[PDB]
Design a protein around this ligand. Structure first.
Ligand SMILES: CCC1=C(C)/C(=C/C2=NC(=C\c3[nH]c(/C=C4\NC(=O)[C@H](C)[C@H]4CC)c(C)c3CCC(=O)O)/C(CCC(=O)O)=C2C)NC1=O
Ligand SMILES: CCC1=C(C)/C(=C/C2=NC(=C\c3[nH]c(/C=C4\NC(=O)[C@H](C)[C@H]4CC)c(C)c3CCC(=O)O)/C(CCC(=O)O)=C2C)NC1=O
Ligand SMILES: CCC1=C(C)/C(=C/C2=NC(=C\c3[nH]c(/C=C4\NC(=O)[C@H](C)[C@H]4CC)c(C)c3CCC(=O)O)/C(CCC(=O)O)=C2C)NC1=O
Ligand SMILES: CCC1=C(C)/C(=C/C2=NC(=C\c3[nH]c(/C=C4\NC(=O)[C@H](C)[C@H]4CC)c(C)c3CCC(=O)O)/C(CCC(=O)O)=C2C)NC1=O
Ligand SMILES: CCC1=C(C)/C(=C/C2=NC(=C\c3[nH]c(/C=C4\NC(=O)[C@H](C)[C@H]4CC)c(C)c3CCC(=O)O)/C(CCC(=O)O)=C2C)NC1=O
Ligand SMILES: CCC1=C(C)/C(=C/C2=NC(=C\c3[nH]c(/C=C4\NC(=O)[C@H](C)[C@H]4CC)c(C)c3CCC(=O)O)/C(CCC(=O)O)=C2C)NC1=O
Ligand SMILES: CCC1=C(C)/C(=C/C2=NC(=C\c3[nH]c(/C=C4\NC(=O)[C@H](C)[C@H]4CC)c(C)c3CCC(=O)O)/C(CCC(=O)O)=C2C)NC1=O
Ligand SMILES: CCC1=C(C)/C(=C/C2=NC(=C\c3[nH]c(/C=C4\NC(=O)[C@H](C)[C@H]4CC)c(C)c3CCC(=O)O)/C(CCC(=O)O)=C2C)NC1=O
Ligand SMILES: CCC1=C(C)/C(=C/C2=NC(=C\c3[nH]c(/C=C4\NC(=O)[C@H](C)[C@H]4CC)c(C)c3CCC(=O)O)/C(CCC(=O)O)=C2C)NC1=O
Ligand SMILES: CCC1=C(C)/C(=C/C2=NC(=C\c3[nH]c(/C=C4\NC(=O)[C@H](C)[C@H]4CC)c(C)c3CCC(=O)O)/C(CCC(=O)O)=C2C)NC1=O
Ligand SMILES: CCC1=C(C)/C(=C/C2=NC(=C\c3[nH]c(/C=C4\NC(=O)[C@H](C)[C@H]4CC)c(C)c3CCC(=O)O)/C(CCC(=O)O)=C2C)NC1=O
Lengths: 289, 161, 172, 162, 172, 64, 172, 162, 172
């Protein structure tokens, strides 16, 4: 539960305790939990009344059908297919189902085989059922509680990875999950099979280097091979990432966002050079030595 | 809402290859289009007279929108322009809805938030209802194409009200 | 999340000492004007939805390319999405001037407003001009008293003006 | 399961909308299929005994060893021949239901769900029923849209079988 | 779920024999009148929402205790719930006459209509009278041809009449 | 079971399992011990394994 | 998602005008050849699984290092994964030639095919050669008529050839 | 990756506890298994070529038709014989890895995950490899705890194979 | 996940040949010293929590800026978070020396330790010094025998020293 630079990481909006559906909920309390289910499973995508599925929702408002089964109902719905299964890549769909239903980022390549293998063998209707009928699902929120992001707490069973992969998955609070910088492409599927993690970036304004994305062609590993033997400087090296380089222009700069590896002794001078290019710094992480 | 793409979305959700149900679906889409294209042609021929008669008929249908000065109503001529733009938008959505073989252009481009903007602008949907009634009275076609278009029009009426 | 009282608490905890007396006098001034915070929040929440329609009115009289087909605010669904964006922006302005700290608006809008608007293709210029016109109309309805007992309100005027400029340079 | 009317109903249920014109076209396509599918099911039911008999004899000549070696899957004695002919008759009856239903649903529910699993646990081979269906699709001898719609169902069973 | 073709398939599979020729002649009659199924479903889905309002009109002219405060249909929320109930009931009638089998309407309404209506305190009498009046109006709009090529439609009239009486004795 | 298969979104029939005597099974931290659930045969095996793994004894199973 | 009808609709909506007459004549040609789309999709979906095995046959006769231990397609699990990849690739080819637009195949394979194949260590060369051989076999089974009424099919041949080259330069 | 040390680690990971004494007993059992499993893997690696050669010849005499008819799964010509002998050598090498790992994990990951699926799509029969493993478990000729631990692994492969 | 037996299996499968005899002699040495793996894991898991408190003791005697307000380990919640981090780090060290392979510790800590620590603002220097002092105390309690039958343990000392330096250069 972060509470230091919680503004910087955007997880300050997800601070609150989860919503719990009571044994005899009122109609308004029902509508709040329905709004929470719509916001979490569709990833802060707002819904029109023509796509509201009021019929399946009324059955939930009765109480004959549980909250978890309502989560199942919205994921079984055709709008979720049209918003998420249909436009996105199927590996990306598996990535989205980890956020939407389990509430965390995938941990390895074994889960993405299990859900791809399952997709080819039995269909999307069965795949969603396998997400929700899980021990990892049922522990954190059995029947009553909405899905919610649990990755910021260790929860006795998180690998380290899902914390930092979640910030590639979700940005901020205001950001709608259908609508991201990469768009159709999947951020984590490159990261999974190499078993590596990119640096954590916070969402915009609070941080102004949010624009930086690692190139798909160039991996740019964090450590940079030897505490800079080749850069030939005695001090340790930090990774530096720049968001834009727009002052330099077209013949000088082929790509706005690049990664530099510097010793700390020359760090100040390169940072001054970046600011002279009008470039704003995304992330700076210690690299080697 | 396109029956080919709805069939593709179905077979995607099943995870199967193309079945013969989809072959029949394609047959039905060709059967619809074989008159839907000519119907869209004569609608595009008639469209200006259609929207002009529909605007004048709605103005005679309720005299008060011409009468009182208001922001939704057509007191001055700019509101008349926006009103005629709206009915022309409606008829163009009808033509797209016809040529697409399903209600999808109508659904995405009108039906998603029409009652919400009617609420926040204090419009009345019954104006466009009686406009579409005048259009479906005015197109004057016969055959399978006429009633397929009429089906699309009353679908817009039912979802509108 | 962060209130101005909790702002003072977080400063005094980062220093780790007790709160200074003059800061407590500033808080005494704050609780003296809390009724004027109530006056302003009540006034603009009374007229908020009409302010949203008038802001969209000036925006759509100004830039007809948005209504024009192919425009970003053209479709009925996207038009309702526009009014949704402006309504929740004014809602977070009301949250911030009720709390007294811009941290609510910053931490729940600054993060992904620019991000969604460059990712979707939304022109941030129109939202910036619209939130500027909405802020001018909000100051216009807040400041003038209609049957209200008289007083000075320049600090509140400065506060909501700062909140709307933070929104404007949030979306840009 | 897999009926284009019911698949249309399941689609409109998932959308939560009323009946659209897409479903009207779907009904048109189903009538267009049935207008020869019923007569094709009629002549298949007329031919069915000769079909399963020739298919069993052709599979027996296709692999002599299932007649030869004494085994539990194979037809050493006559009871295995009876179970084998029962299986191909089951297959052809599923084909007729698959034809008359307008979709692969009777085939899917009644065969395709666990056929390879019982072939695994009984040590059967699906290629036997593959070449049986090949003999059936060679033997029905029909022409027209009905013939190739039935042939489409048969090779669907072949593809899902192997 | 169950179509009349799949009804014949399930009978022929429970018997486990091939389908009889006369049943196939009945199915030939069915596919001969499938265009009239299309005619009827299209006609009443054209007018469906106005039929729902007219049914609620006759119900609320008949029983003013529902509008009366303390009545079950009194509140605005419950009034929208009423129109929801009638709309989805007519929707499942349209589903059943499109499929041709009452199994869809039975298996998705017969189970819990009576159950919800005794559990909530909903008077099943008003819904029964309302679905009866709605069925009369539905037959009224289906049967009369307006610019439609003429034909007999008595079997369809019997079919939707049976569907509405199954709804009426479903809610009671 | 209202709707039959609509809110469950699986065409297959509904089994309506009723469970009793559930006490600290896992983290869900449920408010009462005995509850009634509606499951279809498509996921009946998964929910039954879950019910027994939690610590519950099914008290009645009646097809609705 | 995007059909060629919806392609024309999206062009005419981006322009925001009604559809041109000659484009409607092109659509009349399209619905005239829709039965040949049905002919081709039915033909290659009839033989699809055997086409997948023959493509893996030529691939594994060509490159024995994949079967060789340490190869990427060596293990039984990875071999089933290979046949899974080829089967769903041919499945999306059938989707694209049924729809008529390559948008389905592009938007559901172009995005992460190259990505998974460089992230796993999959040699994209073998998948490119395999989808090329699979496309040649697919044209071979589609074009030749076996008891089929004769006609020209060069436009369809061009279409599935384009679809397989988009797959080939997708994986590379 | 069924390894009792790693399965114990995965268990204590799921519990979130430190190392318990149950895991100490688990390690004791793994050492007790390995103390003969390593020597058994040694003599298996010594015998392996004669084992796979006799197993291939015994399967060829077990069914004469795979030598007889020209087919794609069957060994009509010598390349199919090479692929067949490669498959049984693969099987026995998986058995040795399964023995030396202390669990069924090398077997599970490297064979059992999709063996029946490739047998389905290639029209192989698992009973060929069943009787091959029967010949191997008849041929290794060992005694003691190591012999029956290997035999347990072999019939596990047989049971999961069929 | 990966054990040293499974390490040998994965090497022998990447080569795709049977295991060499000398590697099997090395595994015979390993199973000969498995009781000493048991001795060490039991010894340090006996004293593990007191080792965590003593490591935090030396860290907080060394760097009082962490306890100082505004420090990263200042608050009670963050202090419990610190002890959580050190406890699970020592837990994964015990996992690694029980398995014999560093793959468990690497694959479940190396990935996001540095990442969380630069993203939160955690000074990685203090965790590196703390895991170094914790490793020194762990070797101190493992190596000295208290009523234990005597033997050499230099290989185990090297092993846990390597595990703690991998942790130290993991967090840095
Ligand atoms: C299973 C592998 C695994 C590890 C190792 C792990 C670490 C981990 N350490 C964390 C925090 C922390 N770690 C520290 C560490 C320290 N305090 C200091 O100042 C010193 C430099 C150091 C003392 C040891 C502190 C203070 C926090 C809380 C940071 C915050 O409140 O934002 C957090 C943030 C979540 C929380 O608030 O508890 C994670 C996820 N997570 C994992 O899943
Ligand atoms: C609580 C904080 C918060 C905010 C502020 C927020 C905004 C937000 N605005 C959005 C869209 C939008 N915003 C606009 C905005 C405009 N139309 C224009 O052309 C003008 C430039 C401007 C008029 C005001 C439009 C048209 C969309 C729909 C974009 C689309 O359809 O892709 C979306 C995409 C989802 C949707 O379709 O509704 C989000 C998530 N989300 C949040 O969670
Ligand atoms: C493609 C489908 C589509 C439609 C139909 C559509 C309608 C539409 N009509 C609007 C306004 C309006 N609509 C009217 C219409 C009327 N007042 C009258 O006198 C007449 C009775 C009626 C003519 C129909 C008026 C007067 C306004 C502006 C409201 C005002 O001036 O404040 C607006 C608000 C933006 C604006 O014009 O200024 C939209 C989005 N948008 C769409 O994307
Ligand atoms: C929401 C239901 C509700 C309202 C409205 C409310 C109002 C309220 N506004 C007040 C004072 C006041 N409110 C104002 C505020 C203003 N006057 C101006 O001239 C400006 C236009 C405007 C600021 C934008 C001022 C100047 C005073 C008196 C002196 C002061 O406290 O500053 C007071 C103190 C005594 C009084 O004047 O009645 C109350 C109770 N309390 C409530 O529970
Ligand atoms: C409606 C679709 C449907 C099918 C097709 C079906 C097949 C089916 N065939 C079976 C067995 C069998 N199938 C065979 C068949 C053969 N051995 C041969 O010689 C021939 C090559 C082959 C004839 C096809 C034999 C011999 C058995 C019994 C296996 C044994 O005796 O242990 C069994 C196990 C139960 C039993 O008969 O004793 C099933 C369920 N069940 C169904 O519900
Ligand atoms: C898909 C099949 C299906 C049906 C048919 C269905 C009906 C259904 N009708 C309901 C309520 C209702 N139904 C009525 C009905 C009426 N008002 C009256 O007084 C008259 C007697 C009658 C007018 C038509 C009313 C008032 C409620 C709200 C009851 C309440 O507020 O407790 C409820 C309670 C949930 C809600 O508040 O919306 C359900 C679940 N649910 C389903 O899933
Ligand atoms: C949805 C868009 C659409 C419509 C409307 C459609 C209608 C349709 N109704 C038809 C026939 C018919 N439809 C009817 C039905 C009726 N006639 C009556 O007198 C009764 C009032 C009513 C039954 C309730 C009859 C009697 C025939 C001709 C003979 C027959 O098939 O029974 C036919 C066959 C040839 C023709 O008459 O055009 C078509 C195509 N197809 C479509 O795609
Ligand atoms: C719907 C669109 C879609 C596609 C196309 C897709 C492909 C896809 N192919 C994969 C693997 C694979 N693909 C291959 C491919 C090959 N073997 C070779 O060596 C050759 C170069 C090529 C033979 C055809 C192999 C071996 C794997 C397994 C890789 C591994 O085990 O890591 C994986 C990794 C997951 C798994 O283990 O099954 C995905 C997600 N996923 C999707 O969602
Ligand atoms: C799936 C069950 C099913 C099938 C098979 C089906 C086939 C079908 N293919 C047809 C026409 C045709 N189909 C073809 C296509 C081809 N001919 C060739 O020479 C090429 C090899 C091949 C294209 C790859 C041609 C050329 C015609 C006739 C003229 C034309 O429409 O182009 C027609 C129109 C009239 C007829 O010829 O029967 C039908 C009904 N309909 C169905 O419901
Ligand atoms: C490490 C565990 C492992 C095993 C066991 C394995 C088996 C395996 N055997 C295969 C084929 C094959 N397997 C056979 C085998 C036979 N036909 C016969 O005559 C004999 C009865 C039988 C000898 C067992 C044949 C003939 C083929 C090629 C099928 C054909 O040529 O089309 C294939 C397909 C790829 C290929 O060779 O060409 C695999 C993956 N792969 C693995 O990774
Ligand atoms: C957890 C409950 C439990 C314990 C404690 C256990 C201990 C244990 N440690 C043993 C041997 C041994 N353990 C050690 C280990 C050590 N000696 C030293 O001098 C070092 C300080 C230390 C290594 C860090 C040595 C040297 C031997 C005997 C020779 C050898 O195997 O290396 C043996 C073999 C025979 C014996 O000495 O009793 C047992 C059973 N088994 C258990 O089930």
């Amino acid at each position: 539960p972060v509470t230091v630079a919680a503004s910087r990481l955007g997880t300050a909006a997800f601070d609150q305790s989860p919503v719990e559906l009571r044994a005899n909920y009122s109609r308004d309390d029902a509508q709040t939990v329905i709004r929470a289910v719509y916001r979490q499973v569709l990833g802060n995508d707002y819904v029109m009344s023509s796509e509201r599925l009021t019929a399946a929702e009324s059955l939930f408002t009765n109480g004959f059908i549980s909250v978890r089964d309502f989560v199942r109902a919205v994921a079984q719905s055709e709008l979720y297919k049209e918003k998420f299964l249909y436009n996105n890549f199927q590996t990306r769909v598996i990535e989205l189902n980890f956020k939407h239903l389990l509430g965390r980022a995938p941990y390895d390549e074994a889960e993405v085989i299990e859900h791809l293998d399952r997709y080819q063998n039995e269909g999307f209707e069965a795949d969603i059922n396998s997400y929700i009928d899980s021990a990892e699902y049922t522990e954190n929120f059995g029947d009553n509680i909405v899905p919610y992001i649990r990755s910021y707490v260790v929860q006795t069973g998180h690998r380290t990875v899902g914390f930092t992969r979640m910030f590639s998955l979700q940005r901020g609070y205001a950001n709608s999950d259908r609508a991201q910088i990469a768009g159709n492409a999947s951020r984590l599927a490159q990261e999974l099979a190499r078993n590596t993690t990119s640096a954590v970036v916070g969402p915009s304004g609070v941080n102004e280097g949010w624009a930086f994305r690692s190139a798909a062609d160039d991996y740019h590993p964090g450590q940079s091979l030897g505490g800079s033997t080749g850069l030939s400087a005695d001090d340790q090296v930090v990774r530096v990432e720049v968001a834009a380089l727009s002052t330099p222009r077209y013949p000088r700069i082929r790509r706005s966002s690049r990664v530099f590896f510097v010793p700390v002794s020359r760090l100040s001078q390169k940072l001054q050079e970046i600011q002279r290019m009008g470039g704003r710094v995304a992330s700076i992480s210690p690299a080697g030595q | 809402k396109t029956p080919l793409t709805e069939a593709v979305a179905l077979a995607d959700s099943q995870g199967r290859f193309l079945s013969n149900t989809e072959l029949q679906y394609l047959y039905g889409r060709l059967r619809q289009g074989a008159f839907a294209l000519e119907a869209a042609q004569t609608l595009t021929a008639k469209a200006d007279t259609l929207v002009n008669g529909a605007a004048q008929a709605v103005y005679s249908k309720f005299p008060y929108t011409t009468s009182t000065p208001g922001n939704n109503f057509a007191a001055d001529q700019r509101g008349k322009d926006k009103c005629a733009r709206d009915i022309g938008y409606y008829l163009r959505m009808v033509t797209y809805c016809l040529v697409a073989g399903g209600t999808g252009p109508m659904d995405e481009y009108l039906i998603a938030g029409v009652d919400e903007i009617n609420r926040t602008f204090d419009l009345s949907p019954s104006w466009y209802v009686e406009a579409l009634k005048h259009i479906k009275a005015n197109h004057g076609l016969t055959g399978d194409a006429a009633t397929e278009t009429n089906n699309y029009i009353d679908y817009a009426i039912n979802a509108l009200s | 999340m962060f209130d101005i009282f909790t702002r003072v608490v977080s400063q005094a905890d980062a220093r780790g000492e007790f709160i200074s007396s003059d800061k407590l006098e500033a808080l005494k001034k704050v609780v003296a004007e809390g009724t004027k915070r109530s006056d302003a929040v009540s006034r603009m929440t009374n007229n908020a939805s009409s302010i949203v329609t008038n802001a969209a009115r000036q925006l759509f009289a100004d830039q007809p390319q948005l209504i024009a087909p192919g425009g970003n605010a053209y479709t009925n669904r996207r038009m309702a999405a526009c009014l949704r964006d402006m309504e929740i922006i004014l809602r977070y302005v009301t949250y911030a001037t009720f709390t007294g700290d811009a941290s609510v608006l910053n931490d729940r809008c600054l993060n992904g407003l620019r991000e969604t608007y460059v990712a979707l293709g939304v022109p941030g210029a129109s939202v910036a001009a619209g939130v500027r016109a909405m802020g001018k109309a909000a100051v216009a309805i807040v400041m003038d008293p209609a049957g209200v007992t008289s007083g000075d309100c320049s600090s509140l005027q400065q506060e909501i003006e700062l909140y709307f400029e933070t929104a404007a340079k949030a979306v840009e």
